[PDB]
Design a protein around this ligand. Structure first.
Ligand SMILES: [Cl-]
Ligand SMILES: [Cl-]
Ligand SMILES: [Cl-]
Ligand SMILES: [Cl-]
Ligand SMILES: [Cl-]
Ligand SMILES: [Mg+2]
Length: 302
């Protein structure tokens, strides 16, 4: 294992209100005393004993930290420092204060597909960076797509929450069942080999929702959702996709593909004509098409 900083974090930071909390983690805003700069402190509860289920394993904490330490990119969250005490490992992280992307978009009166792709492209750039380092995020979904500051002319997207991320090992297949059913790829559902492709599936799902306000595979039970995912049971129902471009639907179709090897890669998604129009005709079609804002607002409010 790694020996993280052993000092009391309170000696170096002033901490305040909770910004969020998961099953084994609490996040608090904090201010570094030496610099006066604000960060987010994520307190992760250690398992401490192997037989206990009330915390995170050291293997899992070290994996997340090791991945965070490697990554430096404008569209992914930055790790500042790591502390630990008898009960917690404490990640001092870049503060992302602009809330979830979808909540910010939902406040708009309208959104063209052109404007939508400007935000989506930032997600793609962050994932392009990760995949270039052979890092799979494995938990891409709207609540992990944040804004650094929502009150600037061109808000910057930050991908957060690397708690499921893995460096892909060439010499050994990784198989695991994890994540949120609505957003995971068929190979996750079916305990099949996992790689960078699973993230691309998730991007397809995020894009589908962004444009329509509907979730492609969400069923009435967890089991039904997983069945929909495995069967790639989705539709572009006219109630939701009436003013969606052919290009946008093709983009999504090339991502929501059962066979990971046939799924569009991140490099190819960046060259797809919906993202990178090849002529004026394609450009105008994208600018003309619009997000179903009425339906989308209801999604963000769910
Ligand atoms: Cl800063
Ligand atoms: Cl560090
Ligand atoms: Cl799952
Ligand atoms: Cl299933
Ligand atoms: Cl279809
Ligand atoms: Mg975590």
């Amino acid at each position: 294992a790694t020996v993280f900083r052993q000092e009391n974090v309170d000696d170096y930071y002033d901490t305040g209100e909770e910004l969020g909390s998961g099953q084994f983690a609490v996040v608090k805003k904090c201010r570094e005393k030496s610099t006066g700069l604000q960060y987010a402190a994520k307190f992760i509860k250690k398992r401490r004993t192997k037989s206990s289920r009330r915390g995170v394993s050291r293997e899992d904490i070290e994996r997340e930290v090791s991945i965070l330490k490697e990554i430096q990119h404008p569209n992914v969250i930055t790790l500042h420092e790591v502390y630990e005490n008898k009960t917690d490992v404490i990640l001092i992280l870049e503060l992302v204060a602009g809330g979830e992307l979808f909540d910010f978009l939902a406040e708009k009166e309208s959104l063209t597909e052109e404007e939508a792709t400007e935000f989506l492209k930032q997600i793609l750039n962050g994932v392009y960076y990760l995949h270039s380092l052979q890092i799979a995020h494995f938990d891409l979904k709207p609540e992990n797509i944040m804004l650094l500051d929502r009150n600037v002319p061109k808000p910057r997207i930050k991908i957060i929450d690397f708690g499921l991320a893995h460096k892909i090992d060439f010499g050994n297949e990784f198989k695991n069942i994890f994540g949120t059913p609505e957003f995971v790829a068929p190979e996750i559902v079916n305990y099949e080999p996992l790689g960078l492709e699973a993230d691309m599936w998730s991007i397809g799902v995020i894009t589908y929702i962004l444009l329509s306000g509907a979730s492609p595979f969400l069923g009435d039970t967890k089991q039904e959702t997983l069945a929909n995912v495995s069967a790639v049971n989705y539709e572009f129902e006219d109630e939701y996709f009436s003013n969606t471009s052919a290009l946008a639907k093709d983009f999504i179709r090339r991502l929501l593909v059962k066979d990971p090897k046939k799924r569009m890669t991140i490099q190819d998604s960046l060259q797809h004509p919906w993202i990178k129009p090849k002529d004026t005709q394609q450009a105008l079609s994208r600018k003309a098409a619009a997000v179903n804002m009425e339906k989308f607002k209801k999604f963000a409010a769910r």
